[PDB]
Design an enzyme around this catalytic site. Sequence first.
Site, PDB file in Angstrom:
ATOM      1  N   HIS A  89     -65.940  -1.445  16.539  1.00 29.71           N
ATOM      2  CA  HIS A  89     -65.388  -2.292  15.501  1.00 29.71           C
ATOM      3  C   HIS A  89     -63.874  -2.149  15.486  1.00 29.71           C
ATOM      4  O   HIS A  89     -63.304  -1.214  16.060  1.00 29.71           O
ATOM      5  CB  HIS A  89     -65.942  -1.916  14.124  1.00 29.71           C
ATOM      6  CG  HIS A  89     -67.389  -2.251  13.930  1.00 29.71           C
ATOM      7  ND1 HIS A  89     -67.876  -3.536  14.031  1.00 29.71           N
ATOM      8  CD2 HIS A  89     -68.445  -1.475  13.592  1.00 29.71           C
ATOM      9  CE1 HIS A  89     -69.174  -3.536  13.784  1.00 29.71           C
ATOM     10  NE2 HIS A  89     -69.544  -2.299  13.508  1.00 29.71           N
ATOM     11  N   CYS A 131     -62.898  -6.461  16.779  1.00 26.46           N
ATOM     12  CA  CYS A 131     -62.305  -7.445  15.878  1.00 26.46           C
ATOM     13  C   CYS A 131     -60.847  -7.118  15.584  1.00 26.46           C
ATOM     14  O   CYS A 131     -60.424  -5.959  15.618  1.00 26.46           O
ATOM     15  CB  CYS A 131     -63.072  -7.490  14.560  1.00 26.46           C
ATOM     16  SG  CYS A 131     -64.665  -8.245  14.761  1.00 26.46           S
TER      17      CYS A 131
END
Lengths: 238, 235, 4, 4
Positions: A89, A131
Site C-alpha cells: 500500500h 497507491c
Amino acid sequence: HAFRYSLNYPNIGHCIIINNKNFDRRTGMNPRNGTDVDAGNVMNVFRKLGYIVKVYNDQTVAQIMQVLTTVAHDDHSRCASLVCVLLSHGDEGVFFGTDTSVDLKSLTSLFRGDRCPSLVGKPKLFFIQACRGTELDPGVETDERIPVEADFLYAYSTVPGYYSWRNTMTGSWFIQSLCEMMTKYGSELELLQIMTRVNHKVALDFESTSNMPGFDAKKQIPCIVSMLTKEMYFTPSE
Amino acid sequence: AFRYSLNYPNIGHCIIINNKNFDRRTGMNPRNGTDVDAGNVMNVFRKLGYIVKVYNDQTVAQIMQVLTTVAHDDHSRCASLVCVLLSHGDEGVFFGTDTSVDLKSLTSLFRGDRCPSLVGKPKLFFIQACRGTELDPGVETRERIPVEADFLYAYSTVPGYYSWRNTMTGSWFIQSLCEMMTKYGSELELLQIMTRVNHKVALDFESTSNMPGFDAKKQIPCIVSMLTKEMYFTP
Amino acid sequence: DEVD
Amino acid sequence: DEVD
C-alpha cells in the site's frame, strides 16, 4: 562518453523484492491478494535476465530499512546494476510497511552516490507498485564528479495523487504489464522504450469493474521518472 | 502503433513563458540570462516546424489566461503541444511575476477530459525552475484512455532541489536541451534525447559562487513520462 | 552561476 | 479489481 551503461561485470546485479500482503490490523489496511502472483512473475523475469533475486515478505518499516541499508553497505564492485521492486500500500510520497508508513525518499536515498560508493555511475532501478493518493481517473473516449541523485529510475505504477489498481487473480495492472513487456522486449529494447510500452498496455487494456460506488470503469497510467544519464540495456547485444 | 502520428498539417504550437522581472514585494531577484534561454528555445522549436509564441513577464492570472485559451483552441490539425516554462519555483510550485501557483493547475488544463482536441497527442512540458532549496554536492567517481496519459514533464532538477542558471549562457538545463535538440532532434526519440540532456547537465556543469555553501554544486534533471508512444519530430 |  |  559512453552511450549505454556497461554490462561488463561478473553479475548484472541484485534484485530485491519487498512484497507486502498482510497488514497490522490496527492500520485499517486490507490484505493485498494477488501480490504473490506479482512477486512470482517479477522474480522469474529478473532471474531470467541473470539477476540474483531475493524476496522479502511482509516487512515492517524498520525491517525494510534494515534490509535496504545492508544492501547499500554491501560491495557491488562486481555488479552492473541494482533493481528494487516495492509492492505494498501507499499514499502520496509514502510506502507502507506492514505496521505503518515511511517516506519513499528514505528508502531510495540510501543508494545516493555519496552513501553507496560501489554503485556510483550504475543504474539503480526502482519499480513501485503502490497507491499515491485517493483520486480516480475516469478516462476519456477517443477517435569526474557526478550528482549524487544521478542514475536512478523510479517507475511508479500510477500518477501522483491517484489510486493504483490490482486484480486479485492476475496481480497489479502495472506489474503484470511490466513482466509481459520485459519478457517480450527485455533483450531488444532499452528500458525507457520498454517502459513506454508498459505505459501503453496499462493505459489501453485495463479498466476497473466494481460494484463499490464511485469505483467503476476507472483507468490508470504509470509514471516513469528518469534521472538516468545513459541508455539501459539488459543484454550485451540486441 | 509504436510512434505518435505526425500525419497532421502542423507539428503544433510551442508556448514559452519567460519570467525575468519579479514583484519587488516578493523579494525574488531578477533571472538574468533568461532571454538567452527563451531565444535559444524559440529558434530550436521554430526550426522543427512549431509555431512559437513567447510571453514575457506574466503573472499567475495572466499565465492561466494564456493557457486556458490555448487549451480551448482547436488542435485538430496539430500533432502535439510543447510548453516551455522559465521562472522561479519551489516544490510543486511555479512563480508568476506576482506570486506562486501549483504546477498541477497549469498542466491539468490540458487533461484529456478538459482538452478533447489533444487526446492521444503528446503534450510536452519543459520546466526550468527551482523545486526546493537543497543543493547537490556531487560525488567523485471507441476506446477510452486515461485523462493523465500522453504528458511529458521534463523538469530541470530533482524534487526538493535548486536549479542552476548562468547569466551569460542561460540555464544549465535549457542550454543543454537546446544543444541536444539541435544535434539529434531529427534522428532520435525524445526520451533518448532527454537522457543525453541528463548526461550533459550531470557531467558538464558545476557551480561557482561566492555565497557560502553554494560553491561546487551539481545538478541532474528529472524526466517524468506518461507517454504511451515514442515521440519523433520528423517522419 | 545563480539559483533559479 | 481492488485499489492499493
